Structures are given as structure tokens and as C-alpha cells.
Design an enzyme around this catalytic site. Sequence first.
Site, PDB file in Angstrom:
ATOM      1  N   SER A  32       0.964  -1.089   0.014  1.00  0.00           N
ATOM      2  CA  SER A  32      -0.036  -0.102  -0.032  1.00  0.00           C
ATOM      3  C   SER A  32       1.006   1.162  -0.032  1.00  0.00           C
ATOM      4  CB  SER A  32      -0.922   0.027   1.059  1.00  0.00           C
ATOM      5  OG  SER A  32      -0.334   0.241   2.362  1.00  0.00           O
ATOM      6  N   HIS A  70       0.651   2.677  -8.343  1.00  0.00           N
ATOM      7  CA  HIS A  70       1.884   1.918  -8.960  1.00  0.00           C
ATOM      8  C   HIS A  70       1.405   1.953 -10.393  1.00  0.00           C
ATOM      9  CE1 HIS A  70       4.780  -0.873  -8.970  1.00  0.00           C
ATOM     10  NE2 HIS A  70       3.990  -1.905  -9.707  1.00  0.00           N
ATOM     11  N   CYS A 115       5.406   4.300 -11.234  1.00  0.00           N
ATOM     12  CA  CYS A 115       6.730   3.714 -11.764  1.00  0.00           C
ATOM     13  C   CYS A 115       6.666   3.392 -13.185  1.00  0.00           C
ATOM     14  CB  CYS A 115       6.887   2.282 -11.116  1.00  0.00           C
ATOM     15  SG  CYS A 115       7.876   2.629  -9.394  1.00  0.00           S
TER      16      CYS A 115
END
EC number: 3.4.22.56
Lengths: 139, 141, 4, 4, 93, 93
Positions: A29, A87, A129
Amino acid sequence: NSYKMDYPEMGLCIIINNKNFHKSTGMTSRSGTDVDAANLRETFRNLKYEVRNKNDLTREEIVELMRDVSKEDHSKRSSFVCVLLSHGEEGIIFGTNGPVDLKKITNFFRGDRCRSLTGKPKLFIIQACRGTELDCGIE
Amino acid sequence: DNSYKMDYPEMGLCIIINNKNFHKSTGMTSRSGTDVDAANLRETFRNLKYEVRNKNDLTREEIVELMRDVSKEDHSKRSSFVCVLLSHGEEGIIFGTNGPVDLKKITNFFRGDRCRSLTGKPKLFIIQACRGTELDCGIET
Amino acid sequence: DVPD
Amino acid sequence: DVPD
Amino acid sequence: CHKIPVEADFLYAYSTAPGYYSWRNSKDGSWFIQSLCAMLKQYADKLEFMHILTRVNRKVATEFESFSFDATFHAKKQIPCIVSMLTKELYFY
Amino acid sequence: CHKIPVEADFLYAYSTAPGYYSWRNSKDGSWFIQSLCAMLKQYADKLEFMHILTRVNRKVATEFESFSFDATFHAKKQIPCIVSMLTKELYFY
């Protein structure tokens, strides 16, 4: 020259904030992203933008949210800002349960596909990312 | 502080790789008009004071070898580095006369930890090449 | 005009 | 500091 | 104590959006290099590099549209794509 | 007879170069978003956007270095990536 930015409203700011992910992922998380979203909201209220924080969306909810916003009437808005905190990997943003093409999200605002925003700047700020290489630095 | 130091003795190298003719085994047309392009670039960058080096019709090895060797020059007396690639391409790819080279392989020679005499200085890569095959059918105004 |  |  | 990223201080000025064709007139040369050379010759002493490239972007996008005897290749557009990992402003003088 | 490309007027402010990790700090937030907010707070009354983002590049590039007990993730840097298909200059004032 420069874009026209004295329409009555500056435009929409859509902040998707994905801190907590499903089981099938096993991704950490993303602690501290709430500091990020709170920071974004006030920055953009100071730029006189309509902010909308949405938190913890599945990849299906994202595409829907964006399809909806892309069908709104942007005729009196100068611009459109979109912030994704999550993410990711190259070309990809993660819903709470799996990945989305960024081109699926962004294609809803293509000039042919979103007439009230044609000719007006559309900003995608993406904190995610893009892979797993590390930059080590020099000097 | 906010603006690159553009006042070294020289502005830097301007390398122009101009591929017009391809080995037919690649199946890509002669790139008509690219010499006009190469000539424009040479003259435009002559006025910004660059050392223009023009190379014509390079294979994928000749490209990687030109770029390694230029990356090994002493650039301490140069402000910036410009590299112009004119060729066929796909996403992330530039073609030598005989086949593809990855862009990242060319650019890596000039990373900050590999070409120390350019660390901290602007490295420009102007790339006239396809990145795929989608077609922008545009929209009226 | 021709693609590249 | 954590990779995203 | 003071490193910089090794991918920093690059600027990639691509002729076209990712995924897309790039267009070249068989006689005048490519739309990008055409427009890039005209804008540098006009603004390289006045404008910062990013703003010169923005005006290149505007010239390719508005002034060029493909003419082809091939219907599938005809009346297409182009937008170039500036990618800056630059850390400061860039002035050519 | 006037069209613009359908990908024009997009700006992509990615947190990190293509292929690389982006760094988030547990208490202060991701490196990129802190700098973007600090830079807009300072200069969105003074500077075209692309120059605000160039300052975000410099901030992230020079004022952050990963810290970790894990050697593989220690002393790592990051450079964000401006992807601009914009056709004009953008001022928030």
C-alpha cells in the site's frame, strides 16, 4: 503565442489516488500518497481549478470515471488537469486490482473524441513507476 | 542558476546522421527529400555556432560506432551536444541502412556517468523518424 | 507527401 | 523512501 | 553528497507522437525539420528552446496536411513530441 | 480547410524517465508531487508552465537521493520526464 485562459472557469482537476490494492496484486500500500493528494488539492484550488479527489478505484472504475468526464460540457472551461497517483509500469497505471493502458484513459480526450476540449490544453500529471531500472547518479 | 552555461569556447558538436538509401533486404523506400532536410540542418546549426559533422548512409554498426567514438571525445570546452537522426523508424528504433538500432543504445553513450565531459550539459536529440504506424486523421476546427 |  |  | 541522475539533461525532440507515422514531403523534406529550421532561424536569439519547440509543434500541427494519391495515406496530420529531461533553461547565445 | 491532429494539446508530466522507478517517501509524499506543488506555489504567477516543470526537473534531480537500509535501493536518483504535444504557451495567470 499562448493559450486562452480567461474562460469563466479554469477547468476540472481530477485526482485519482490509489493507496490500497487488492489481494491478486500483492503490491505494497502506497503510504504517503494521501499527503500527495491533499497537497495537489490545495495547489489547484489556488490555481482556481475544480478539484475532485477520487480514492481507491478499480481499473474499471477509472476508465468509467474518465469516459464520464470526457462526455461533460467543457465549453466554458479553459483546460483539463488529470492526476494519477498509483503503482505503474511503462504505458500503464494500476487500478486497485490490475493495470490500465494510459492510452485508454487519455484517448477519451482526443480532439475528435471530446469536442468541448479541442484546442484547449489537457494535462496528465502521472506519479507511477515506469519500469524497475534504478538511476545511480554521478559527479 | 536557471539557465545552462551556453558560453564555453564552443557550442559543441552537431552530428547529423542522414540515411536516404536502404539495403533492399530491409524493404524501405529511398527517403526522397531528406537531403534538403540535411542541408537545412547544416546551415541552421552553422548559425548557432555548432561544429556540424554530417554523415550519410550509415549501417547499424556505423551508427553505434560513430556514437561510441564521439562519446569518447573531450567535450570540456563545449557547451552542448546535438545529434540529429534522419531515417526510418519504429517506436524506440532508428534504422541503419541495413536494419534497426534501438534509440536507447545510442543515447546511453552520453549518460552522465559514461561521458563525463558532458555531465551537466544539455544533450539534444532531434529525431526525424516514424514511431509506429498509426495515422492521425485529425478533426475540423 | 509520404510516411517515414 | 520506497519505489513506486 | 551532490549527484545528478544519469538520465538527466537529455532533450528528445521527436518528429511525431509515440505510435504514429512521421511525414516527409518528397521535395521539400520532412515537415518537422522544415518547421524546426524555420523556427530556430526566426527565434533562436529571442526564445528559450522549449518555446521554440512549442512553436515548431504549432507549425507542424496547423500548416501541414498530407496530400497523397493513396486514399489511405491522404489528409493526415502530425504533432511532434518534445521530451525534456532538461534541468535548466536553454538559450542559444 | 483547417484541422489539428487529434493528439495535439496534450501535456504528459511523468514523475520519472521511461523505464525507471519513481520514488515516494513514506511521510512527506512522492518526490515528484512535492516539487510540483512547491514549484507551482512559487512560480505559477511568474512563469510559463514548461518552465515551471523544468524547475520541477531540477528540484527532483538535485534535492532528492533515496535512503534505504536495503543496499539495492540506497542512494538512488530520479529525473522526471516532460512529454509535451502542446501547441501554445500555458500561463496560469
